[PDB]
């Protein structure tokens, strides 16, 4: 059963998603962002000492 | 309160059809129908 | 045979699929416990038992 949602990028925020299949009882998910990391791409130019 | 000739009496004095005795279904509230003694 | 009075019909879920995708619940008032012959009087819906 395909589904889609949008959740905030805030650390520790207890996001809850609701899935409502027409033939089954509703379900609730809990997703939490414990930790993020932004990785840039680097090119070395020179070294100074 | 004796049940009919085609009815079975649970130990709670309730009457259920004989065809429901030992059918693997707990028809009686006290499972008298599925009791081991009655089913043998 | 048990005497059935005040019989109402409600549907929990419906999904017109190839398999038996419909759950039906009946509320009634009776005097004894027995067996009834359940039938549907249209070919739009086919019962299972
Ligand atoms: Ca039984």
Swiss-Prot record, chain B:
Disulfide bond entries: 3-15, 10-28, 22-39
Highest taxon listed in the record's lineage: Eukaryota
Subcellular location field: Cell membrane; Membrane, Clathrin-coated pit
Tissue specificity of this protein: Abundant in heart and skeletal muscle; also ovary and kidney; not in liver.
Domain LDL-receptor class A stretches: 1-40
Post-translational modification as stated in the protein's UniProt record: Glycosylated.
Task performed by this protein: Multifunctional cell surface receptor that binds VLDL and transports it into cells by endocytosis and therefore plays an important role in energy metabolism. Also binds to a wide range of other molecules including Reelin/RELN or apolipoprotein E/APOE-containing ligands as well as clusterin/CLU. In the off-state of the pathway, forms homooligomers or heterooligomers with LRP8. Upon binding to ligands, homooligomers are rearranged to higher order receptor clusters that transmit the extracellular RELN signal to intracellular signaling processes by binding to DAB1. (Microbial infection) Acts as a receptor for Semliki Forest virus.
Summary of subunit composition and partner proteins: Homooligomer. Binds to the extracellular matrix protein Reelin/RELN. Interacts with LRP8. Interacts with LDLRAP1. Interacts with SNX17. Interacts with DAB1. Interacts with PCSK9. Interacts with PAFAH1B3 and PAFAH1B2, the catalytic complex of (PAF-AH (I)) heterotetrameric enzyme; these interactions may modulate the Reelin pathway. Interacts with STX5; this interaction mediates VLDLR translocation from the endoplasmic reticulum to the plasma membrane. Interacts with CLU. (Microbial infection) Interacts with protein VP1 of the minor-group human rhinoviruses (HRVs) through the second and third LDL-receptor class A domains.
Disease: Cerebellar ataxia, impaired intellectual development, and dysequilibrium syndrome 1: An autosomal recessive, congenital, non-progressive cerebellar ataxia associated with disturbed equilibrium, delayed ambulation, intellectual disability, cerebellar hypoplasia and mild cerebral gyral simplification. Additional features include short stature, strabismus, pes planus and, rarely, seizures.
The name this protein goes by in its record: Very low-density lipoprotein receptor
Organism: Homo sapiens (Human)
Primary gene name: VLDLR
Region of the whole protein represented: 191 to 230 of 873
């Amino acid at each position: 059963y395909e589904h889609s949602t949008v959740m905030p990028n805030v650390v520790g925020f207890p996001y809850k998603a609701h899935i409502e299949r027409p033939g089954y009882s509703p379900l609730t998910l809990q997703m939490q962002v414990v930790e993020t990391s932004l990785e840039p791409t680097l090119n070395l130019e020179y070294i100074t000492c | 309160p004796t049940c009919g000739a085609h009815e079975f009496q649970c130990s709670t004095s309730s009457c259920i059809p004989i065809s429901w005795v030992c059918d693997d279904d707990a028809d009686c509230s006290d499972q008298s129908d599925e009791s081991l003694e009655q089913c043998g | 045979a048990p005497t059935i009075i005040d019989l109402t019909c409600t549907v929990a879920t419906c999904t017109h699929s190839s398999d038996f995708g419909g759950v039906l619940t009946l509320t009634y008032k009776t005097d004894k416990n027995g067996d009834c012959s359940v039938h549907s009087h249209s070919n739009v819906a086919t019962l299972q038992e």
